[PDB]
Ligand binder design. Structure first.
Ligand SMILES: C=C(C)CCOP(=O)(O)OP(=O)(O)O
Ligand SMILES: C=C(C)CCOP(=O)(O)OP(=O)(O)O
Ligand SMILES: CC(C)=CCSP(=O)(O)OP(=O)(O)O
Ligand SMILES: CC(C)=CCSP(=O)(O)OP(=O)(O)O
Ligand SMILES: [Mg+2]
Ligand SMILES: [Mg+2]
Lengths: 240, 233
């Protein structure tokens, strides 16, 4: 039995985006066009990311969720997967002495135990920082987030900790790994115009911004153009 | 315990459609806002006839979201009343028509027009038109979860059986998912439409207001889609 008409206003959104989501596309192409190995360009993810957080933090942006590794690029090249997972360990060097709090969402339990330790250390070292919250989606996906939230709700219902009539938008928010407040703005570099199983639940009323700029070329100027674009946009949330 | 590493998804088989821009179309032409909404169903029928000729098999169209209840009483009543016209426009066409959404919130009269429209068209072999009325992506994922929870409490599945396939079969919009999404009206957002189903869908946004969306705008969108597929495939 369903009822949705007189139900409440329950939306985790909104001149400055509080939360920006980011899909970092274009790295392999950027190596080719300049000439370097495709190893490179992937080298620029972490420095660019630190740079983006610096600019963003200065502007008043409070959260950034960055899409590093989906559940689908486990089937990219055998050599390229082993490279990227080991390179992300250098998160520790770049962020551990910053004002940046750092969390990782995804199925951590399937990664190299080395990487599991680096993530736990990076999370604990930065947990007290008062600055901008940087969430890194690693071995994450939209289907994944919704399914694990569902198993967790099913398990509670089987142990009498809730019933079917408790299952609503707030309950589901509390079980998902990416929580309120949801992204006001999604930025995808690299020219593709889709979400590719990143967030799904969370994007319900996000403003989308797509650019052809490859990610290593995405500098302060490009980021300000994205934020000005967003500020020109009229958000109605289904109303008038 | 999680473990990670689709019998869904050049001519798109399933198109998803967000029919936005009706009030601004009216107001620009000096017309009352309700003149805009009177073009929704006729335009949608016209788009079904064009799509059927192109080989498209499914269209899922956003007619009323769970958030549109926030407009004025006058605007809501006109729309729920106007959607009874679905019976007139489609009962004697070649389109097969289904409605997704929480029907029990609607006026009992509209519930009857809907049930009659589904009944009279159920045998049509042509294009399948799915109309999302009082629908939302939040709603659809929540109702799929409650259904999964009740199966568990009746001993029909374990938590370790919960996966992408089981979840798809509980949702109101099922596989195959939309290949292409077309949103008229100029805005770049999905507005709580088919959240789970759009994971790999191509997003096509256009400034053309819905009452102006014609055959050539539709052919341009499909041509964009075919270009994207050569690029990222
Ligand atoms: C599987 C393919 C085609 C390459 C993956 O590239 P991304 O990680 O950028 O994701 P999509 O291009 O598929 O959206
Ligand atoms: C029935 C439809 C097409 C809902 C989306 O249109 P809206 O006008 O409600 O979307 P927003 O601009 O408010 O996000
Ligand atoms: C998804 C990740 C890790 C990076 C996105 S950039 P890429 O490596 O997929 O490079 P291209 O899109 O092929 O140019
Ligand atoms: C189809 C419905 C009910 C809404 C989408 S069109 P609209 O009423 O939102 O018109 P505007 O976006 O206000 O121009
Ligand atoms: Mg890519
Ligand atoms: Mg609108």
């Amino acid at each position: 039995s369903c009822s949705l008409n007189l139900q409440t206003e329950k939306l985790c959104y909104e001149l400055m985006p509080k939360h920006i989501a980011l899909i970092m596309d274009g790295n392999r192409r950027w190596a080719k066009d300049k000439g370097l190995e495709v190893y490179e360009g992937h080298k620029h993810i972490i420095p660019k990311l630190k740079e983006i957080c610096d600019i963003s933090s200065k502007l008043g942006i409070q959260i950034i969720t960055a899409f590093a590794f989906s559940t689908e690029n486990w089937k990219r090249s055998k050599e390229e997967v082993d490279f990227l997972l080991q390179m992300f360990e250098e998160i520790y060097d770049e962020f551990s002495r910053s004002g940046v709090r750092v969390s990782i969402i995804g199925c951590k339990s399937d990664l190299p135990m080395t990487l599991q330790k680096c993530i736990a250390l990076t999370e604990e070292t930065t947990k007290g920082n008062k600055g901008l919250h940087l969430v890194i989606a690693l071995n994450y996906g939209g289907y994944y987030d919704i399914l694990q939230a569902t198993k967790s709700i099913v398990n509670k219902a089987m142990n009498g900790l809730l019933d079917v009539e408790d299952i609503n938008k707030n309950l589901f928010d509390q079980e998902l790994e990416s929580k309120c407040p949801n992204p006001d703005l999604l930025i995808r570099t690299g020219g593709e115009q889709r979400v590719s199983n990143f967030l799904l639940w969370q994007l319900a009323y996000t403003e989308f911004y797509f650019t052809n700029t490859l990610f290593p070329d995405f500098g302060e100027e490009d980021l300000k153009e994205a934020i000005m674009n967003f500020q020109q946009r009229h958000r109605r949330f289904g109303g008038h």
